[PDB]
Protein: aromatic prenyltransferase
Amino acid sequence: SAVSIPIKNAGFEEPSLTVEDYYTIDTPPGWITYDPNGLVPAKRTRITSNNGVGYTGPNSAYYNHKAPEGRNVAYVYLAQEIGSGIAGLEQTLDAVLKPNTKYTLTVDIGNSGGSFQGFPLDGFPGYRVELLAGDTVLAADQNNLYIKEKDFKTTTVTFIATPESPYLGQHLGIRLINPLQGKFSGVDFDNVRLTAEPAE
Amino acid sequence: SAVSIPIKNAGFEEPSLTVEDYYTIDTPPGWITYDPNGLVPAKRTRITSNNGVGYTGPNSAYYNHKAPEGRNVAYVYLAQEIGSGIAGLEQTLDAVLKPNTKYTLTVDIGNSGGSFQGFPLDGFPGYRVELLAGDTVLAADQNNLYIKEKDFKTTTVTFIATPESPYLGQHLGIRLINPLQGKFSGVDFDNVRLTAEPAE
Ligand SMILES: CN1CCC/C1=C1\C=Nc2ccccc21
Ligand SMILES: CN1CCC/C1=C1\C=Nc2ccccc21
Ligand SMILES: CN1CCC/C1=C1\C=Nc2ccccc21
Ligand SMILES: CN1CCC/C1=C1\C=Nc2ccccc21
Ligand SMILES: [Ca+2]
Ligand SMILES: [Ca+2]
Ligand SMILES: [Ca+2]
Ligand SMILES: [Ca+2]
Ligand SMILES: [Mg+2]
Ligand SMILES: [Mg+2]
Structure:
């Protein structure tokens, strides 16, 4: 029997947004911008690399169906050329890595489609989802799921920490990454969940 | 109906070894060493970081079962401390990245156990498996599978290339990586396969 690990703003439902297709351009509350190649400015515009939340409802321009969870999805957009690097959202959790524990990290990934002000949203930069302890990537999935235009799909990253793990006691983390491997170079995320259960 | 893509020395059966638990310390034929943090020297000894093939039959001291395929597995051993970097095995293939095609990379991963002349082999450095186009990681699995001591498990890495992919016409590649996330810091591979099939 699997226990949920608390995540802040796990569904990006904060801040609440009023109108369909509206969005913020500030880091979703409870999350941090992961920007190892310095592609995302502190003060963003609508044409810079940016991240935030977007109201995706039953009549979204960008997806067939509403947000997998609630009304909002998170998004990560990189303006720069392909190969310029990677960026995304990260959150350090209160839970620490425990031995003999199977961790299950699920998140829905969106390939926004259609168009914004005449600009085609066709194409996708890919995704990479990472479970961390300290500053170590313990386990990751990059692009194992194909995601159609205007669609979302759930991925699962799993990891088992042994008593021998050098990372026990270190704070867990979750990273949601735009690897900038295609244009249009926007990727969306929703419904982040992490569970712990006993393993052998 | 998936077509298999030709890989040199896919099963690490070259070179042909004849005695149980014997092993080479040179890069398997067909493959190059992947050594981006300079942990693996050009002239190796039995005590340096190294890679090679290893006869793994029904009597092996390191695995319960024989090699997943044939009588050899590949190994990648890193002598340096955890965190010192990553290394592994790489092979650029003939075949290139085609649009509307689903690639399935499967490879068996081995957690050597037991002991060698008293020295214990418990612990595991993790693994990462990469499908490449050119120098780009299209898709990857890092440590989604838990591998018990003395066991092998099969991982599957899948990727779909869309007609608007930037890497079409670049050579497919395979990387099998020891990310030095634990000790004993050896990891084994066997039975690499890559298939292609039409994809929506
Ligand atoms: C292309 N751009 C740059 C910033 C403005 C914009 C979008 C606005 N909403 C959007 C929803 C989906 C995709 C793009 C946008
Ligand atoms: C604001 N931006 C900039 C580019 C990407 C984007 C959105 C992505 N998904 C969304 C869903 C609803 C509203 C906006 C976006
Ligand atoms: C324990 N060490 C490091 C130095 C040499 C070595 C091994 C030799 N054969 C081996 C087979 C399996 C695992 C390790 C070794
Ligand atoms: C020779 N080495 C160096 C350290 C690791 C190792 C082996 C790993 N698996 C193996 C299977 C058969 C024989 C040797 C090894
Ligand atoms: Ca949501
Ligand atoms: Ca798209
Ligand atoms: Ca073999
Ligand atoms: Ca081991
Ligand atoms: Mg920045
Ligand atoms: Mg070297």
